[PDB]
Amino acid sequence: EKFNLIDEPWIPVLKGGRVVEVGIGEALLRAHEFARIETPSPLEEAVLHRLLLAVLHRALSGPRCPEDVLDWWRKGGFPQDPIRDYLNRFRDRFFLFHPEAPFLQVADLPEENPLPWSKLLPELNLPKATYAQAARALLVHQAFAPGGLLRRYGVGSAKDAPVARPALFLPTGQNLLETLLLNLVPYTPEDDAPIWEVPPLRLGDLEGARTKWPLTGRTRVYTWPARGVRLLDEGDGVRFMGYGPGVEPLEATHRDPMVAQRLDAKGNLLVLRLSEERSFWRDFSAMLPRQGGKVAATLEHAENLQGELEDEGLEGRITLRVLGQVSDQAKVLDIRREVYPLPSGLLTPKAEENLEKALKMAEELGQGLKHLAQEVAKAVVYLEELTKLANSLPLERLYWHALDGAFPRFFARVEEEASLDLWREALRGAALEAWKATRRFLGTGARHLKALAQGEQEFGRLLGELG
């Protein structure tokens, strides 16, 4: 019917320092001409990559082995004919509006009593979305929608979209081709199918949580129908939509290639999550095997490929992006993008031993500073005021904040054993700077002073440990 996502411009890409919008076809067939997918929403960036990856995996029936992807990097593009043959064949499943099979939507959701399209967006008068915006918001909702209250068509309480919670690891090259190659983890198509390879979903199938699937196909999970949606064409835009239950995810053993894991205190594997009291890079030693963690398959694929690129004289110009939501329950507190170098030989025991040391020191000094802040607040004065004064002190905040700036430079040089020492100095520098700010806080009013004397005692004590 209208607006084919393979053809029409809707994926924002950077071409020659300029943002332009392209379809899937151009984004895939001519990937080398774009530096990256360029969008303000890290959630959009994430799903736009996942969709393309889904399409490549199926059109190439692979990559079957690491070697395939290494071969295509050399040629400077991937097999082009099988992309076209695939896009031709499933073309009619890629219209945003369609009387039987609209993309990621439910055809027979009803027009009356619609919800606004703004409901697809994360919750941190109503404008008309362009078709391109409607398409992107749909994609983000289906990947990132948190579980909670639905109370529609017999379900009541909806489940998490598959990628609602975890931080997503996305290696990036210097153009889109390389970035896609760096995320094309070896794949086998058997017993996996993306949403457009399976018959369109209908309201009858979805009422009362009737359609349940194992949460276990890579491309099935990349394109999982987490909610029933039906965008309504206003003429030249979208404001309203039908809205209902999607497919219920049943528990299966499967980890999304972009998801990493770590042991918690009690010794259970959790997914690395973004959070605002804790810098993300503090989980980078925990996600490794030597501490019982699992590293994101994408990061693993890329580091190995970086090895095989170096040994052939090819580049190791690879950055890691982390995308995702910070959230509690049905609420989304924040959306973040974080950038890190992807250092050569990161999964070598020399670099991993250096990494464990560098975080252990940081957590060790940090908990010391945390306890210093605890004693100081007790000297200044129920747990009302003690925890109120706790955060009021800039000691821990400034300390971790300064290491945010310092961690990238350490992390790129992580294969050196001459790095551990520059790091040891960064810690001193960050502690000194944070303590100075706390001395500014304590020397301004005469009653904050019995805290300051004894605080300085323990601060000097702490600096003697590592140095």
Q: Where are the beta strands (DSSP E) in 79-151?
A: 95-97, 115-116, 148-149
Provide the b/e sequence for 219-254 (b: ≥16 CB within 10 Å).
Answer: bbbbbbbbbbbbbebeeeebbbbbbbbbbbbeeeee
- Spatial contact of 359 and 284, defined as CB atoms under 8 Å apart: yes
Same domain, 114 and 228: yes
Same domain, 314 and 363: no
Same domain, 391 and 322: no
Question: Distance (Å, rounded) from C-alpha 193 to C-alpha 61?
Answer: 11
Q: How far is CA 336 from CA 189, 269, 323, in A?
A: 32, 23, 6
Among 103, 111, 112, residue whose Cα is nearest residue 131 = 103
Among 298, 45, 13, 87, residue whose Cα is nearest residue 181 = 298
- Counting other chains too, the contacts that 279-282 makes at CB distance below 8 Å and 24 or more residues apart are 279/400, 279/403, 279/404, 279/407, 280/167, 280/322, 280/338, 281/340, 281/404, 281/407, 281/411, 282/359, 282/362, 282/363
Same domain, 306 and 323: yes
- Spatial contact of 338 and 326, defined as CB atoms under 8 Å apart: no
Among 185, 171, 180, 183, residue whose Cα is nearest residue 32 = 180
Same domain, 51 and 175: yes
Same domain, 313 and 354: no
Same domain, 280 and 209: yes
For the domain that residue 443 is a member of, what is the CATH number?
1.10.132.100
Q: Exposed/middle/buried for 127, CB within 10 Å: 0-12, 13-18, 19+?
A: exposed
Same domain, 336 and 318: yes
Question: Distance (Å, rounded) from C-alpha 322 to C-alpha 326?
Answer: 12
Provide the b/e sequence for 56-66 (b: ≥16 CB within 10 Å).
Answer: bbbbbebbeee
Q: How far is CA 98 from CA 4, 143, 231, 350, in A?
A: 10, 22, 10, 56
Exp. method: X-ray
Resolution in A: 2.5
Domain boundary among the residues 344, 363, 380 is at: 344
Domain that holds residue 464: 345-467
- When divided into structural domains, the chain yields a total of 2
Question: Distance (Å, rounded) from C-alpha 262 to C-alpha 279?
Answer: 15
Domain boundary among the residues 329, 344, 359 is at: 344
Q: State which amino acid sits at residue 114.
A: P
Q: Which phi and psi angles does 197 have, rounded to 5°?
A: -95, -10
Among 27, 75, 85, residue whose Cα is nearest residue 52 = 27
Same domain, 142 and 199: yes
Same domain, 335 and 350: no
Question: Distance (Å, rounded) from C-alpha 113 to C-alpha 219?
Answer: 33
**Tokens representing 144?**
């990132």
Same domain, 321 and 357: no
The 3-state DSSP class for residue 331 equals: strand
Same domain, 352 and 337: no
Question: Distance (Å, rounded) from C-alpha 20 to C-alpha 24?
Answer: 13
**Tokens representing 436?**
């100075």
Domain boundary among the residues 344, 365, 389 is at: 344
